[PDB]
């Protein structure tokens, strides 16, 4: 068959003060009248049954999860004891499928307007997997040189639009992101993945036993076991843990509009710089993304800043620095 793994187990620290530990980004209606998570399940449901859809989560957001995705079975929600980033998150999820069953790993913080373009891309990814095995990533074609994107360099072509990962890069300085685009053959690391359960779990033991050995004989739905094991599991991402080191990483071309709700800069790029109005007063200040809350905000003498007013607090952030909003959360919480 096929199984979709929805990763909804992070904090969404970079979206303070809208996102909190009590209410992470996954449940916010940033776009449309639907949450980030809801949009992801709907896109998935287009072609798949709910029975086939699995959500790896922190124990706290279980009840939240049941609300947003009522059609999801109670059993298909997995509750983690601790968050240790996307690497372990993938391991517990992949064990639930059949050994040879293809598992589509999806972040819940992606905005992909064209769901059919999406599914064509997942179909092609499905056939590539059958044809070459390995671990697939979905590389978005850059439309700009955005910092705060991981990148994928293209290796030897296998078939049209499917290549080996020549080089897996991260964290571009402003010029280093201009370098990337120029080339013609650097794609944005989407954060989506496709693999067959068995091959993936096999590469984890090779690449990251720290992960494997403590989770190989652990049942995912045993909370008290998962707890006991996660105490020895490292907090590393899928990418640093596996997708860099592994010698069978492939990349498929995702030729569609795609955005990652990573940091506040991403929301700006969607709806654009805020224009002056009764509630947002501007004086010698260009390229501002303000978000108001029943009282006006004036920015004077500042350009390329994010301003977000909330009952949780106010963020005032230079756009370049948007990735550091973690620090705020870390200190505050």
Ligand X SMILES: Nc1nc2c(ncn2[C@@H]2O[C@H](COP(=O)(O)OP(=O)(O)OP(=O)(O)O)[C@@H](O)[C@H]2O)c(=O)[nH]1
Binding residues for its own copies, rule: CB under 8 A, are 16-17, 276, 281, 283-284, 295-302, 305, 307, 309, 311-318, 320-322, 324-325, 327-328, 331-332
Report how far residue 170's alpha carbon sits from residue 152's, in angstroms, rounded to the nearest whole number: 9
Q: In whole angstroms, what is the distance from residue 199 CA to residue 164 CA?
A: 16
9 in a labelled binding site: yes
User: Where would I find the beta strands (DSSP E) of the chain?
Assistant: 3-8, 53-58, 77-80, 102-107, 110-111, 135-140, 151-159, 162-169, 186-196, 249-254, 259-260, 280-283, 288-291, 297-300, 305-310, 313-318
Radius of gyration of the chain (CA): 20
Site residues for ligand X, 37-66, by CB under 6 A, read 56-57
Residue 84 assigned to a binding site: yes
Q: Is 8 in the site for ligand X (CB under 6 A)?
A: yes
Half-sphere exposure of 135 (CA within 13 A, CB side): 25
- Both structure tokens of 249: 């990483």
State the binding partner of 139 from ligand X, its own copies, none, CB within 5 to 8 A by kind: none
Query: d(Cα 330, Cα 333) in Å, to the nearest integer?
Result: 5
Is the Cβ of residue 123 or residue 171 nearer to its own copies in the bound state? Answer: 171
Give the end-to-end CA distance of the chain in Å, rounded to a whole number. Answer: 43
Does 56 show up as a binding residue in the annotation?
Answer: yes
Q: Which is nearer to ligand X, 24 or 102 (CB)?
A: 24
Residue 80 in marked binding region? yes
Which of these ranges, 82-90, 155-163, 246-254, 288-296, lies near ligand X under the rule CB under 6 A? 82-90
Q: Which does 9 bind (CB under 5 to 8 A by kind): its own copies, ligand X, none?
A: ligand X
Stretch that binds ligand X, among 69-77, 80-88, 217-225, 302-310 (CB under 6 A): 80-88
Nearer to its own copies by C-beta: 1 or 314? 314
Tell me which residues touch ligand X (CB under 6 A).
Answer: 7-14, 25-26, 56-57, 80, 83-86, 89, 107-109, 262, 326
């Amino acid at each position: 068959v096929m199984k979709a793994l929805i990763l909804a187990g992070g904090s969404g620290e970079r979206f303070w003060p809208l996102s909190t530990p009590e209410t992470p980004k996954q449940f916010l209606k940033l776009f449309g009248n639907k949450s980030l998570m809801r949009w992801t399940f709907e896109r998935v449901l287009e072609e798949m049954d709910p029975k086939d859809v699995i959500v790896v989560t922190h124990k706290d957001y279980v009840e939240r999860t049941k609300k947003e995705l009522p059609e999801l079975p109670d059993e298909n929600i997995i509750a983690e004891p601790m968050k240790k980033n996307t690497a372990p998150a993938c391991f517990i999820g992949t064990k639930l499928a059949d050994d040879d069953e293809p598992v589509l790993v999806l972040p819940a913080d992606h905005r992909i307007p064209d769901t059919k373009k999406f599914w064509k891309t997942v179909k092609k990814a499905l056939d590539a997997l059958e044809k070459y095995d390995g671990l697939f990533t979905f590389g978005i074609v850059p439309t700009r040189p955005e910092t705060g994107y991981g990148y994928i360099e293209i290796g030897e072509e296998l078939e049209e639009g499917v290549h080996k990962v020549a080089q897996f890069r991260e964290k571009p300085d402003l010029e280093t992101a201009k370098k990337f685009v120029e080339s013609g053959r650097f794609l944005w690391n989407s954060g989506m993945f496709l693999w067959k359960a068995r091959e993936f779990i096999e590469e984890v033991k090779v690449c990251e036993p720290s992960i494997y050995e403590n989770l190989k004989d652990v049942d995912p739905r045993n909370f008290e076991e998962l707890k006991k094991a996660y105490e020895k599991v490292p907090s590393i991402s899928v990418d640093y843990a596996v997708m860099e080191k592994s010698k069978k990483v492939r990349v498929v071309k995702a030729d569609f509009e795609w955005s990652d709700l990573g940091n506040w800069s991403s929301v700006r790029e969607i709806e654009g710089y805020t224009e002056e109005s009764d509630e947002v007063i501007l004086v010698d200040s260009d390229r501002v993304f303000v978000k108001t809350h029943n009282k006006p905000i004036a920015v004077v003498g500042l350009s390329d800043v994010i301003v977000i007013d909330t009952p949780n607090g106010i963020l005032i952030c230079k756009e370049e620095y948007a990735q550091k909003v973690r620090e705020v959360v870390k200190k505050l919480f």
